[PDB]
Structures are given as C-alpha cells and as structure tokens.
Design an enzyme around this catalytic site. Structure first.
Site, PDB file in Angstrom:
ATOM      1  N   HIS A 166       0.855  -1.225   0.000  1.00  0.00           N
ATOM      2  CA  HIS A 166       0.000   0.000   0.000  1.00  0.00           C
ATOM      3  C   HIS A 166       0.879   1.259   0.000  1.00  0.00           C
ATOM      4  O   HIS A 166       1.990   1.262   0.541  1.00  0.00           O
ATOM      5  CB  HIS A 166      -0.907   0.046   1.249  1.00  0.00           C
ATOM      6  N   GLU A 346      -2.640 -13.217  -2.491  1.00  0.00           N
ATOM      7  CA  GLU A 346      -2.374 -12.849  -1.076  1.00  0.00           C
ATOM      8  C   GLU A 346      -2.174 -14.145  -0.279  1.00  0.00           C
ATOM      9  O   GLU A 346      -2.989 -15.051  -0.402  1.00  0.00           O
ATOM     10  CB  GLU A 346      -3.563 -12.098  -0.451  1.00  0.00           C
ATOM     11  N   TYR A 347      -1.135 -14.265   0.499  1.00  0.00           N
ATOM     12  CA  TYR A 347      -0.972 -15.446   1.379  1.00  0.00           C
ATOM     13  C   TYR A 347      -0.219 -14.986   2.628  1.00  0.00           C
ATOM     14  O   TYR A 347       0.269 -13.867   2.649  1.00  0.00           O
ATOM     15  CB  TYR A 347      -0.347 -16.652   0.651  1.00  0.00           C
ATOM     16  N   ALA A 348      -0.219 -15.815   3.674  1.00  0.00           N
ATOM     17  CA  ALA A 348       0.630 -15.589   4.867  1.00  0.00           C
ATOM     18  C   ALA A 348       0.339 -14.199   5.453  1.00  0.00           C
ATOM     19  O   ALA A 348       1.217 -13.352   5.428  1.00  0.00           O
ATOM     20  CB  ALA A 348       2.104 -15.728   4.506  1.00  0.00           C
ATOM     21  N   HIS A 349      -0.858 -13.965   5.955  1.00  0.00           N
ATOM     22  CA  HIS A 349      -1.282 -12.704   6.581  1.00  0.00           C
ATOM     23  C   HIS A 349      -0.374 -12.337   7.754  1.00  0.00           C
ATOM     24  O   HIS A 349      -0.474 -12.966   8.792  1.00  0.00           O
ATOM     25  CB  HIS A 349      -2.725 -12.894   7.092  1.00  0.00           C
ATOM     26  N   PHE A 410      -6.742  -4.371  12.630  1.00  0.00           N
ATOM     27  CA  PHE A 410      -6.632  -5.044  11.328  1.00  0.00           C
ATOM     28  C   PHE A 410      -5.923  -4.193  10.269  1.00  0.00           C
ATOM     29  O   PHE A 410      -5.646  -4.678   9.160  1.00  0.00           O
ATOM     30  CB  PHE A 410      -7.988  -5.533  10.817  1.00  0.00           C
ATOM     31  N   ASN A 413      -0.702  -5.099   9.221  1.00  0.00           N
ATOM     32  CA  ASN A 413      -0.428  -6.428   8.711  1.00  0.00           C
ATOM     33  C   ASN A 413       0.989  -6.469   8.120  1.00  0.00           C
ATOM     34  O   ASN A 413       1.290  -7.368   7.319  1.00  0.00           O
ATOM     35  CB  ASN A 413      -1.469  -6.840   7.657  1.00  0.00           C
TER      36      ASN A 413
HETATM   37  O1  LIG Z   1      -6.199  -7.456   6.641  1.00  0.00           O
HETATM   38  C1  LIG Z   1      -7.525  -7.970   6.717  1.00  0.00           C
HETATM   39  C2  LIG Z   1      -7.832  -8.953   5.592  1.00  0.00           C
HETATM   40  O2  LIG Z   1      -9.237  -9.167   5.656  1.00  0.00           O
HETATM   41  C3  LIG Z   1      -9.764 -10.153   4.778  1.00  0.00           C
HETATM   42  S1  LIG Z   1     -11.596 -10.181   4.964  1.00  0.00           S
HETATM   43  C4  LIG Z   1     -11.814 -11.248   6.433  1.00  0.00           C
HETATM   44  C5  LIG Z   1     -11.260 -10.729   7.765  1.00  0.00           C
HETATM   45  C6  LIG Z   1     -11.922  -9.510   8.361  1.00  0.00           C
HETATM   46  C7  LIG Z   1     -13.229  -9.154   8.013  1.00  0.00           C
HETATM   47  C8  LIG Z   1     -13.833  -8.028   8.567  1.00  0.00           C
HETATM   48  C9  LIG Z   1     -13.130  -7.240   9.483  1.00  0.00           C
HETATM   49  C10 LIG Z   1     -11.824  -7.582   9.833  1.00  0.00           C
HETATM   50  C11 LIG Z   1     -11.231  -8.714   9.276  1.00  0.00           C
HETATM   51  C12 LIG Z   1      -9.428  -9.798   3.317  1.00  0.00           C
HETATM   52  O3  LIG Z   1      -9.855 -10.854   2.459  1.00  0.00           O
HETATM   53  C13 LIG Z   1      -7.931  -9.522   3.138  1.00  0.00           C
HETATM   54  O4  LIG Z   1      -7.678  -9.058   1.813  1.00  0.00           O
HETATM   55  C14 LIG Z   1      -7.430  -8.483   4.173  1.00  0.00           C
HETATM   56  O5  LIG Z   1      -7.968  -7.192   3.860  1.00  0.00           O
END
Ligand SMILES: OC[C@H]1O[C@@H](SCCc2ccccc2)[C@H](O)[C@@H](O)[C@H]1O
Ligand SMILES: OC[C@H]1O[C@@H](SCCc2ccccc2)[C@H](O)[C@@H](O)[C@H]1O
Ligand SMILES: [Mg+2]
EC number: 3.2.1.23
Lengths: 416, 208
Positions: A166, A346-349, A410, A413
C-alpha cells in the site's frame, strides 16, 4: 461520490489533493500517444522494436517522425517515416499515425535479476530537420507468456517472491515521496523479494520508473473494489456500472503499458464475478496481448483470469465454502480440466506476531512446477502517529480518531 | 465368470514381461518380436471381450517402452473402443496408456530416477500438460510385517478426484509345501528346492 462505491479497499479512508499538480505546454501539432512493443526470435538473439506514434493538430506533407534507440551514449537503432498507416479496412487507414520497426541484434534482456534498459527517443520534426517536439521512455526487452500451464519470462519459468504494498506514510498519510519509495525498494531486494503487487490501485507514476531501474516485477491493478456490497457482485454484474468500471481499467492500461516492469494486469480486487469483469478481461487481451490478465473475485479461477490466483488458500487443508471453495493449492492444480499456473495474490497474513508455517508454502513452491509463488500480505503496517499531553508521538490504529464503526488493529499487517 | 456373478472389476493383462533384458525394452523395441507380442495381445482380446467384469485391458508388465507397445495399444483401441487400455512400462505415462499407472510411487516424496522418475502421486497429477486419471497398478508391497503408511494413500485417494485408487501388491503368499523326516509339512520359499540363483523370500508378498 458514486465513485466511492468502487473504492472499498481495506485502508484508511482519507481525502484531498494527495498527488502532484503540474502545468504542461505542448505545441498545437503534437505527439498525442505512443506505444512500444518488442518481438523476438526463438532464442532471443534478434528483436524487433515496433513503435506506433499518433499525432493531433494539422497534418502537413512535410511532417516526419524519427524514433531512435540508445544504450547509454551509443545509438543502437533508428527509423524515420512520414505519417500514414497501412490500410486497415474498406475506408482506408489512419492518416494521423505511423509505425516504425527497428531491428536490434543481440539485445540485452530486461529481468528483475539484471534490469538492462534502453532509451527510446521519439521526435516530431519537419522534412528539412527542424524539431517540433520530442518524447522519450525507458525500454526493456523481455517477453512474458503463458505456455503449457507455466508463466515464462524470456523463455524461463518464473518463481515469484512477491509482496503486496500500500502507499502509506505514518505522518503524511497517502502522500508518497521519492525518498520513501527508494527506501521500500532497497529493503525489498535486500530481503530476497523480486515482485510487488500494487494493492489495490495504480501507483504514483514514479514507482514504475524505479521498479524498471532496480528490477522488480509489478502487477498493476485497476482501482475497483466493491467488498462491502451484498452479494459482492451487486454492482459488477449490473450493466449500468459497466461505464464507470471501464474508465478505471482502460485509463490504467493507456497510462502504464510502456513500462517493462509491469508484467501482469489485474482487474481489481474482491468484487465478486460479474459479466462486467468478462467484458473488461477481453478488452485488455485485445488491446495489449503482451501481458496476462489476472483477477481473483468469484472463486479465483473464473473465465476472467489467465492465472489461478486464490487468496489465503492453504498448502494441504481444503476450506470448502459454498459457491467459492478455497481448495488446498496442491489439489487445486489437478482438478478435472484445470491447466493454468497458480500464483497466490495474497498469502501468509502478517498481522502482529505471525508467519507461522511460511516454510510449508516455500517447500510446495519448489516441488510443484505449476505453483509459481505468491504475494505476502503485506509490506508495511498502516498505523498513524498521534501525540500525547507531553507531545510524545505514539502509533495509533482503527478507532483512535473517534472513527466508528472501525476495524481496530486489522490495519497493521506489515512485515515492517 | 465368477467375477461377473459376484461383482469384481477386472484388469485383464497380456502374457508379456521382459524384465530381465538389458535395457528392459531390448525385445519390445525390435520389429522381429512384433509378431510374437501381437499373438499374445490379439488372442486375449478375442477370448475375453464379452465379459462384463473386464473393464480395462493391459499390454503386460515391466517390458520398457517400445514401438511394439504403441502399435498394440492402437490395435485394441480400434477393435474394442469400449474399454480403456493401460500399460506401466517406460515411466507409467507414455503414449501407450490411457491412465497414468505407476508402481510404488509414494504419496508425498519424489524418487527422481534418470529417464523413468517416480513422482509423488499428488505432484504427478499436475505436471504441465497432464490430464489423465491416476490409478496405481501396484502399491503398498505387503512382504512380511508390512503395510505401514497405508492410511496415507487412502487419505489422498479420498481428497483428490483424479486419484482413483490402486491395486495392492499382492493377494496370496507364493510359498510351496515341503516335508521333513517325520513327514510334517512346512512352508518353503526361493532356494529351498536347490534352485540357484533364487530370490529367497521375495516370493511371499501376500495379505493372506
Ligand atoms: O487485513 C484484513 C484482511 O481481511 C480479509 S476479509 C476477512 C477478515 C476480516 C473481516 C472483517 C473485518 C476484519 C477482518 C481480506 O480478504 C484480506 O484481503 C485483508 O484485507
Ligand atoms: O515382489 C518383488 C517386487 O520386485 C520389484 S523389482 C525390485 C526389487 C527386487 C529386485 C530383484 C530381486 C528381488 C527384489 C518389482 O517391481 C515388483 O513388481 C515385485 O515383483
Ligand atoms: Mg477488501
């Protein structure tokens, strides 16, 4: 604005004039566009550089276009022509375009390991030699294709050591400067990354120049994400939004198609699968056949992608969700009918204390030819700076600005 | 007849095996042996083609890969298009088979031998270009106290659609009966009849 409906990326929502403003002066008779394409023989020992130039203003017989190719201070190839393309259809050809072909013997090839660049200069001048205007860009000779289920660069199969990045700065928000961009590129290469995904929109124009010069593969991505819609394809399956989506895809391709570092186009992110995505997949394949197109929405393997590109699929364990299952990556490859390469978008959060099981992805990438790597999520934490009572700085995250509802930590990351 | 009445699928196999040749395809790549091999394949098909239990034909076993195998693969496809043909020799995935049919490939571990590698079965499926189903013609060698890791095959068979199972090696021990001085029977194996050279207890691989 109604454009906000297509910009639901996971990031701080901010606003303003956040990139450069400039004035440009052109003459009335001017270069209005140019495209550069490179074609090779079977062993990359001979290349043809093809340059299409278009003009605007009043056509005259004395107008000429010269394209020259430089390696350092040595001129390598040159071509000159008057305007007037070859016949295209029953009504004729483009009077206001010309195509030069330049032969180049034993070109030095561009790759992330050795980023060899040439310089192309385009000159609009009169037949008697007076220059009207010049334009230029960096040229890298490379070929990207998918053959027999493998993504190839210069005939060899790639292994993508990728990261998502980003545009974020803790003091300036979404304002990018050169010094920050160079710092990110040096740290990436020093940690054995070779590729970067523009998550999830086109970057500042200087980013692609730096990736060309230092050597990173780029996935360039359209500014389209409708994650918060129910169902996710409510807008991308509607023909009333086909106009708004097409401007986001067609203007990105017209801006960035000359950069050697851009090797893959992406239709955006997390917007389900709609007929609008199929229409735009086919538009790019037709105007720019030299790069594959990828798109993850609607289960990562729809008819709108050349590459299977799941997010967060596991190495060995299936996650069988209704309509959009995430198969284990080793099993996905061998489903009845499947022939495409697999690269995880996207992998390995990397949220907090994370990356457990990272070795298990890299064991699988090295053992299976059609697993060609992936992009880690993600490069840098999106925290902002706040000040306490004594004026000491601290790192803040979702909800620390009275913003509500919010998604708390969140936003952090990053690997850095 | 019994497999038709009770219900078992049968792979019917031609009497051709040239394992001890060097290289293994010395005879099956020679056109002077094409006559002898064709009688073994064409007479089996003319005898057994009416049995419902026969679902797959096999060109034989362990004879490398020769042009004679390609010729006979195509002969069966033309006279009997209603059953697939399989053949394992020459690396288990040649142009003479409809099914990838390795012997003793492992679930997760590659064994990269020159010219005839045995890939892990999960990886074999997804090699560039590969579209065929995979059925192991021999797996899980049951010699003595054996079948360790059997659960690992069955986990993979159930999870991957194109892994459609396999044939264990094998059903019954090939031991013979000898008698001692008091006339008590005992189970004998290679070398117990003064036969030499012999391969000793490798004749006992059975589940029973
Ligand atoms: O860094 C968060 C990640 O969240 C998940 S959604 C499922 C998790 C989630 C949903 C709602 C609020 C917080 C997390 C996305 O698929 C990723 O691209 C990334 O953005
Ligand atoms: O039951 C023995 C097995 O031996 C191996 S050869 C490799 C092992 C070996 C070689 C020479 C002598 C003894 C064993 C075969 O491939 C199998 O079909 C099966 O016949
Ligand atoms: Mg999202």
């Amino acid at each position: 604005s109604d454009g906000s409906y297509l910009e639901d990326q996971d990031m701080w929502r901010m606003s303003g004039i956040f990139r450069d403003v400039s004035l440009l002066h052109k003459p009335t008779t001017q270069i209005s566009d140019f495209h550069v394409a490179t074609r090779f023989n079977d062993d990359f020992s001979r290349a043809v550089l093809e340059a299409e130039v278009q003009m605007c203003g009043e056509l005259r017989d004395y107008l000429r276009v010269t394209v020259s190719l430089w390696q350092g201070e040595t001129q390598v190839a040159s071509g000159t022509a008057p305007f007037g393309g070859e016949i295209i259809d029953e009504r004729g050809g483009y009077a206001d375009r010309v195509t030069l072909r330049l032969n180049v013997e034993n070109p030095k090839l561009w790759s992330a390991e050795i980023p060899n660049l040439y310089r192309a200069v385009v000159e609009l001048h009169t037949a008697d030699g007076t220059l009207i205007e010049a334009e230029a860009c960096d040229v890298g000779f490379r070929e990207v294709r998918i053959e027999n289920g493998l993504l190839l660069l210069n005939g060899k199969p790639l292994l993508i050591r990728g990261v998502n990045r980003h545009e974020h700065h803790p003091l300036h928000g979404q304002v990018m400067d050169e010094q920050t961009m160079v710092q990110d590129i040096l740290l990436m290469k020093q940690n054995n990354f070779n590729a970067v995904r523009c998550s999830h929109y086109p970057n500042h124009p200087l980013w692609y120049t730096l990736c060309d010069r230092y050597g990173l593969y780029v996935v360039d991505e359209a500014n389209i994400e409708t994650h918060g819609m129910v169902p996710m394809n409510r807008l991308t399956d509607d023909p009333r939004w086909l106009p708004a989506m097409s401007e986001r895809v067609t203007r990105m391709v017209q801006r960035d198609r000359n950069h050697p570092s851009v090797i893959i186009w992406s239709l955006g992110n997390e917007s389900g699968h709609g007929a609008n995505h199929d229409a735009l997949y086919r538009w790019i394949k037709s105007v720019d056949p030299s790069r594959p197109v990828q798109y993850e929405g609607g289960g990562a393997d729809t008819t709108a992608t050349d590459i299977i590109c799941p997010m967060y699929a596991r190495v060995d364990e299936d996650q069988p969700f209704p309509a959009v299952p995430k198969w284990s990556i080793k099993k996905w490859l061998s489903l009845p009918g499947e022939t495409r390469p697999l690269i995880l978008c996207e992998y390995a959060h990397a949220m907090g204390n994370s990356l457990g099981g990272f070795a298990k992805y890299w064991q699988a990438f090295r053992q299976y030819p059609r697993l060609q790597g992936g992009f880690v999520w993600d490069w840098v934490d999106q925290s902002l700076i706040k000040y306490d009572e004594n004026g000491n700085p601290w790192s803040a995250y979702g909800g620390d600005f009275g913003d509500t509802p919010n998604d708390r930590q969140f936003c952090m990351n990053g690997l850095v």
